[PDB]
Design a protein around this nucleic acid. Structure first.
Ligand SMILES: [Ca+2]
Ligand SMILES: [Ca+2]
Ligand SMILES: [Ca+2]
Ligand SMILES: [Zn+2]
Ligand SMILES: [Zn+2]
Ligand SMILES: [Zn+2]
Ligand SMILES: [Zn+2]
Lengths: 478, 478
DNA sequence: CATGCGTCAATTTTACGCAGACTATCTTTCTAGGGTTAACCCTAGAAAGATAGTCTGCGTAAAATTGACGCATG
DNA sequence: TTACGCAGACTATCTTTCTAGGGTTAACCCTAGAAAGATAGTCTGCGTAA
């Protein structure tokens, strides 16, 4: 079955549809329905303007269009005071006013606030749980992974009393919400993933690394695929217990130097030359100890074919040569997200998560798109063009409806008319036949003394005219 | 002696003069002279046209204007492919062109290439010395420091081949060029500074920390001041050497652990209760050992005559409070430069220094500006308005020279004319020479490639049209 | 006052000629970002550097376009 | 008829919290400046007059 989009994802050449696969109707309807509860709750008697109206599904799509465009322009840390400034750009004011944008960001909700106070017992993630599960479900069901998978962590930076907040040194951002994730290697596709809550996490007799590899692997259990892991996810009993009737997955990965299972032989940094390696085995698994420059050693473990080899062009053991090519799956997805991200400063952790889901949906939709286009021998566009097209496909319906107000200021009326795709009625270029003059005649607005040959026929009334009097259109037809 | 700008730059009430104050004409003249040396060598006989013309002083000013505006916005890591995309913004296209900006950016030079090959043996930093020395000189003569000074280090982040860079783990942009500097605490004004060249710096029998404090202190060795710093710069003999006749400074700072000058009295014991402190004395100097909540100690040193008592709001000794409140003197210069800054990737090292100098000049110019306006009882504008005004005052003389060419593309002419202050007396919108441009030579709706002239316009929409389409009104007007 | 043709001369439109400044997109080369077995390694995507193409002004000579008179009966 | 007053939807700018960012004594601390939140306005098009 190789790898690529599934049957229900075939022949989609429209990046709006590739995006909707991850933001289904159920997700959009829940956001609009619950958001309106806050708009009603926070409305006061003096708040009677247009700015304080409820949310429509067209408007929720448009605000998402804005988030996609800020990611493209890399200006997500710029204030709304400047983003909506007409003297610098009209790209963000033709879609929404500055004030309604600020108002909606404060009001978005993903749950029923009247149920939540008891619904939350035993689940700290409750306020965003329905949307998260609807979203993850579409990752799992829309694509077939290849032979190599990899599992690693990703952080969503956040400060602001999040009950799941973790402090993690040796990161760009020290505080945030941790997410565990599984990706298709080579083609960086998110297959699965689960937030780490840590209160609201229960693994009975199971260390976290083992727990998450087994649960993330769910869709591929029994398929004979290979998973690449760093130290957090490589316990030996994981490597051995994934080769059973249930679970048929191999493990390739690093081992912490303090594991007792590594023979002391493979730790003797004093006798080994630089560039050399040692191999040993335990039942089905192969362990290799490689010694780079002095005072360092590398421990790699794997479930693999028995043959061992060294790539003579570098002198490194093949397990290292191989490891280095699959370990980057999750991280590569993370750096792609950092180049183009929708994240904004916010005061509520559940909003931070929406931004995270948008960043992922915009990448997974690109992967489905490039497979459907390149498989037909067509050229595939870069990410920048893909996202410019989402902007127009997500905001055009809304922009068009804004023109119905009698009062839009001309700044907006003109930019919406020009940016909005210019469909022009009549451009079918096939007219209806109506009688016309086929003989030589004179201008009816000219005196008989002139007998000016008519050289035109009125656009809206087919009158015989001279260009001097009635140029193309007749005066009465203007 | 007070604190604030000096007499020579006191009655300056605008941003352009405050900026020119730091760079001066000697720097602009040297850059233009040497830049032209490369333009004349990289130009081939097949490369003709406006894009390959030499550099004028007015264009180099426009060039700085673009970098400044780029710093106001956060978009300084955008490709030149879309910073100059007129469908998103008119900010940059109205000043130059995409291609001339790329050509000039790779051609700037700050020296005489025929002389340097015999200077470079000692002057490792040659290619920027005649720009750098003048800049520092100007900084020193324009501002009077206060009683509190802070000395610390900054990295520029450039990767590539150039013996100025050094690798520093546990830092963002870990591989760049290191610069040392001294700032006036409270205004965060830069007084002095100098690069670290790795080798050839000729510090002899003196650690770099002591060496640089002494050299950087020169411009302030008048009345006595207190200088503070972290561990890199706090050797005890520095503290004592700064109190000898030729020196005027006292020192307050942290102490690196395991130094021979610190007693076992302060280093010790597991039995010291948490939250307490202990003092030891040596002639003029006071040493304090403070043990915060985590129960690990911090060592501070002071050559000041300040009282050893505790600030009873925190329980911390006053000496600790002083350090925490003064150490940010350099760090926040970098925070300001982490928000609004010019930096671009490049393959050529000396540009890293050029961009650093622009960022510094903008901050110091703002400090002088704010002081001079508030001292008159007027309002001080925020840093963002200051920067927007530098863009407007720095590029306008250049833009007026683009509107000389009979063929400048008209969409630029329309934008240039409107975003430009009116310096011409006796004119008005209804009394102008502009309407000679009404007679656009070509048809709005015909391809420009056929050069089909238009002798008519659409009455209802006021657009220029050709008879082939329509004569009186355009096809869209009816 | 109103409509059916004919005779070419005047006016306007079209088709390119010169020139000038700016613009979209291609294929190498190699830094920015960040992780981590790593004072090493990978990936993505922007600068380097070049080519062919797009708008804007101005000029001239044909080609198609009127339009000012010759009727023509009523 | 020229040109005035009304309500709709959009906009600038102030004063209070309190997060992004970095550095380091630091699982803590400090800073600038954005978001939160509210109060005054601007600019468009639809009914009246001499
Ligand atoms: Ca706001
Ligand atoms: Ca370029
Ligand atoms: Ca420091
Ligand atoms: Zn006529
Ligand atoms: Zn008509
Ligand atoms: Zn035309
Ligand atoms: Zn028109």
């Amino acid at each position: 079955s190789q790898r690529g989009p599934t049957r229900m994802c075939r022949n989609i050449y429209d990046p709006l549809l590739c995006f909707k696969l991850f933001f289904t109707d159920e997700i959009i309807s829940e956001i609009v329905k619950w958001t309106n509860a806050e708009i009603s709750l926070k409305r006061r008697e003096s708040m009677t303007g247009a700015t304080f109206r409820d949310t429509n599904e067209d408007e929720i799509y448009a605000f998402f269009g804005i988030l996609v465009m800020t990611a493209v322009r890399k200006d997500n840390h710029m204030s709304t005071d400047d983003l909506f400034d007409r003297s610098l750009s009209m790209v963000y004011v033709s879609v929404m006013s500055r004030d309604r944008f600020d108002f909606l960001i404060r009001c978005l909700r993903m749950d029923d606030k009247s149920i939540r106070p008891t619904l939350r017992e035993n689940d700290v993630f409750t306020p965003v749980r329905k949307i998260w599960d609807l979203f993850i479900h579409q990752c799992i069901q829309n694509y077939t992974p290849g032979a190599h998978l990899t599992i690693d962590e990703q952080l969503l930076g956040f400060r602001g009393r999040c009950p799941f907040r973790m402090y993690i040194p040796n990161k760009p951002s020290k505080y945030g919400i941790k997410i565990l994730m599984m990706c298709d290697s080579g083609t960086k596709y998110m297959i699965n993933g689960m937030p780490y809550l840590g209160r609201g996490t229960q693994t009975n007799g199971v260390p976290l690394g083992e727990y998450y590899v087994k649960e993330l692997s769910k869709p591929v259990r029994g398929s004979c695929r290979n998973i690449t892991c760093d130290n957090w996810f490589t316990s030996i009993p994981l490597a051995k217990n994934l080769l059973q009737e249930p679970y048929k997955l191999t493990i390739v990965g690093t081992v912490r130097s303090n594991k007792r299972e590594i023979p002391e032989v493979l730790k003797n940094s004093r006798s080994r030359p630089v560039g050399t390696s040692m191999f040993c085995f335990d039942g089905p698994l192969t362990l290799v100890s490689y010694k780079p420059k002095p005072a360092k050693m590398v421990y790699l473990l794997s479930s693999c074919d028995e043959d061992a080899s060294i790539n003579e062009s570098t002198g490194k053991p093949q397990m290292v040569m191989y490891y280095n090519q699959t370990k980057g799956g999750v991280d590569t997805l993370d750096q792609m997200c950092s180049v183009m991200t929708c994240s904004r400063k916010t005061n509520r952790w559940p909003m931070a998560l929406l931004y995270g889901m948008i960043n992922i949906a915009c990448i997974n939709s690109f992967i489905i798109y490039s497979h459907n286009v390149s498989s037909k021998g067509e050229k595939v566009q870069s990410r920048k063009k893909f996202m410019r097209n989402l902007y127009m496909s997500l905001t055009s319906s809304f922009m068009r409806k804004r023109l119905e107000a009698p009062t839009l200021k001309r700044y907006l009326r003109d930019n919406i008319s020009n940016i909005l795709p210019n469909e022009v009625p009549g451009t079918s270029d096939d007219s209806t036949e109506e009688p016309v003059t086929k003989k030589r005649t004179y201008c009816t607005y000219c005196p008989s003394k002139i007998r000016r040959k008519a050289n035109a026929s009125c656009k809206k009334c087919k009158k015989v005219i001279c260009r001097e009097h009635n140029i193309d259109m007749c005066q009465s037809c203007f």
